[PDB]
Amino acid sequence: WKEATTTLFCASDAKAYDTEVHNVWATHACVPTDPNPQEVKLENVTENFNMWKNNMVEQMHEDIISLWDQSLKPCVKLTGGSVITQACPKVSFEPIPIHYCAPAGFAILKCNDKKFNGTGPCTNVSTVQCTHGIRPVVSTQLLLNGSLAEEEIVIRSENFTNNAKTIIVQLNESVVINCTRPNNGDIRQAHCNLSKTQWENTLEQIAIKLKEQFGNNKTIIFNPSSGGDPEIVTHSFNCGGEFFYCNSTQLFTWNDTGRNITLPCRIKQIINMWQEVGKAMYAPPIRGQIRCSSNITGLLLTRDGGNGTEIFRPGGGDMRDNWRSELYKYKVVKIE
Ligand SMILES: *[C@@H]1O[C@H](CO)[C@@H](O)[C@H](O)[C@H]1NC(C)=O
Ligand SMILES: *[C@@H]1O[C@H](CO)[C@@H](O)[C@H](O)[C@H]1NC(C)=O
Ligand SMILES: *[C@@H]1O[C@H](CO)[C@@H](O)[C@H](O)[C@H]1NC(C)=O
Ligand SMILES: *[C@@H]1O[C@H](CO)[C@@H](O)[C@H](O)[C@H]1NC(C)=O
Ligand SMILES: *[C@@H]1O[C@H](CO)[C@@H](O)[C@H](O)[C@H]1NC(C)=O
Ligand SMILES: *[C@@H]1O[C@H](CO)[C@@H](O)[C@H](O)[C@H]1NC(C)=O
Ligand SMILES: *[C@@H]1O[C@H](CO)[C@@H](O)[C@H](O)[C@H]1NC(C)=O
Ligand SMILES: *[C@@H]1O[C@H](CO)[C@@H](O)[C@H](O)[C@H]1NC(C)=O
Ligand SMILES: *[C@@H]1O[C@H](CO)[C@@H](O)[C@H](O)[C@H]1NC(C)=O
């Protein structure tokens, strides 16, 4: 079998009666999943995997972009010199698991190694028809509603010596963060709550995996975002069709030397688009309480670099990194 680039088709459990945009897009661009997927483990076979050059990350990415271009209609969209204005009605926004599968003559390989670091060989390979349900969660600094690692915290980078490369952290235990726009004074003011002690344990367990990649003479320190667009400066995401911008300063101030962490949040109308370079405008925040509990299953940090003391700051920006943390243990091959 050889790795080829084909036209994938997505599968989903989308209800036709649900008017939530993901359920509507998936009842249009996807197919009903198979209740009994046949995963066949390959005997005595070792294959090469590369998550950093996977095509499925691309086709998924374009599908999410095409999804958003039909789902979240902005009032004003501004790209390089051109202006796009249209109706901007608020909708139901709750990401549904999207399964990706291979066409006829093709199959999907799956690495089952418990320590797989992203690139290299694999001794435990199987062949499934469709990938697992990947919730297309668009967020920064922290990954959400994703798939946890089976064993330990498997940090992954394209080049660890390269400080410009994003290290995608995959947790083995999740932390639940509850974000809330109180009903009520300020319709843009919101917040999020998570366990303070549960969070300091993650920063500690991660700082051990970081001493296994850069040396045990290193002192791991976590600092906030350096600068840039608020999308990567704060923990930006989308809860209830609203774009939250949670200041994660308290999340990224740590050293090895209350009980709840409350992140000050802000519902913003103007968004720096991730699909392409530009800006988008949406209607003012809706009425009532906007709230959704999420599971922090992964991270997106970076390294400063440039001796002894290693500083790590929250990253993000490229939503392909979001897909890779789910589409790493996979590849498309052509069966003869
Ligand atoms: C993968 O190989 C076998 C299952 O096929 C298993 O015994 C072994 O522990 C796995 N490898 C790792 C990384 O543990
Ligand atoms: C969870 O991760 C911790 C270290 O971060 C590890 O010690 C533990 O074995 C993991 N739990 C399981 C059951 O994978
Ligand atoms: C890894 O990153 C370093 C620093 O950017 C670079 O000099 C080196 O060429 C890279 N190594 C690889 C894998 O080519
Ligand atoms: C988050 O809300 C969940 C229910 O969704 C609850 O179990 C938990 O106590 C809340 N956590 C925090 C830190 O508020
Ligand atoms: C690094 O580890 C070696 C191991 O013996 C130790 O001698 C040395 O003091 C350490 N150096 C630093 C930079 O901490
Ligand atoms: C949020 O972070 C900003 C700087 O990024 C800081 O000035 C502010 O004090 C933080 N808010 C709170 C209440 O922690
Ligand atoms: C580092 O650790 C000390 C003691 O826990 C704490 O008071 C201080 O705020 C921390 N500051 C950093 C991140 O250097
Ligand atoms: C995670 O999933 C839950 C349940 O669908 C949802 O309420 C929440 O908004 C999701 N989080 C994000 C940021 O997509
Ligand atoms: C968090 O999400 C997982 C699967 O994504 C789900 O099983 C679980 O019920 C959710 N909440 C928690 C922390 O149990």
For residue 98, the surrounding DSSP H or E stretch is: strand 98-101
Enumerate residues 6+ apart whose C-beta is below 8 A from 208: none
DSSP 3-state assignment of 332? Answer: strand
Task: Work out the burial of residue 302: count CB atoms within 10 Å of its CB; fewer than 13 is exposed, 13-18 middle, 19 or more buried.
Answer: buried
- Ligand 4 surroundings by CB, under 6 angstroms: 176, 178, 193-195, 260, 293
* Residues 223 and 257: beta-carbon distance below 8 Å: no
> In terms of residue numbers, what domain contains 86?
1-336
Query: Would you say the CB of residue 249 lies under 6 angstroms from ligand 6?
Result: yes
DSSP strand pairing (309-314 vs 260-266): unpaired
Query: Would you say the CB of residue 161 lies under 6 angstroms from ligand 3?
Result: yes
Number of domains observed in the structure of the chain: 1
Three-state secondary structure of 130-154: ECCCECCCCECCEEECCCCCCCCCE
Q: Which atom of ligand 9 is nearest to the CA of 174?
A: 13
C-alpha distance from residue 49 to each of 2, 89, 243, 313 (Å): 12, 42, 35, 28
Query: Would you say the CB of residue 151 lies under 6 angstroms from ligand 2?
Result: yes
Nearest-angstrom CA–CA distance, 241 and 264: 18
Q: Which atom of ligand 9 is nearest to the CA of 293?
A: 11
* CA 246 to centroid of ligand 1, rounded, Å: 40
DSSP string, 255-301: -----EEEEEEE--SEEE-SSSSEEEE-PPP-SS-EEEEEEEEEEEE
Q: Which atom of ligand 2 is nearest to the CA of 153?
A: 5
Nearest-angstrom CA–CA distance, 80 and 276: 10
Q: With CA atoms as reference, report the closest residue to 302 among 139, 155, 127, 132.
A: 155
Identify the CATH number of the domain in which residue 15 sits.
2.170.40.20
Type of residue numbered 122: C
Locate 314 and state its tokens.
């929250």
**Ramachandran assignment for 319, one of left (phi > 0), alpha (psi -120 to 50 degrees), beta (any other):** alpha
C-alpha distance from residue 329 to each of 10, 165, 220 (Å): 17, 20, 28
Among the bound ligands, the one closest to the CA of 158: 3
Nearest-angstrom CA–CA distance, 100 and 88: 30
Query: Would you say the CB of residue 115 lies under 6 angstroms from ligand 1?
Result: yes
Locate 189 and state its tokens.
């003011």
* CA 134 to centroid of ligand 4, rounded, Å: 23
Among the bound ligands, the one closest to the CA of 161: 3
PDB resolution in Å? 3.4
DSSP string, 175-221: EEEEEEE-----TTEEEEEEEHHHHHHHHHHHHHHTTTTS-TT-EEE
DSSP string, 209-243: HTTTTS-TT-EEEE----SS-HHHHTEEEEETTEE
Which of 174, 292, 296 best tests ligand 9's pocket when mutated (most atoms within 8 Å of CB)? 174
Among the bound ligands, the one closest to the CA of 219: 5
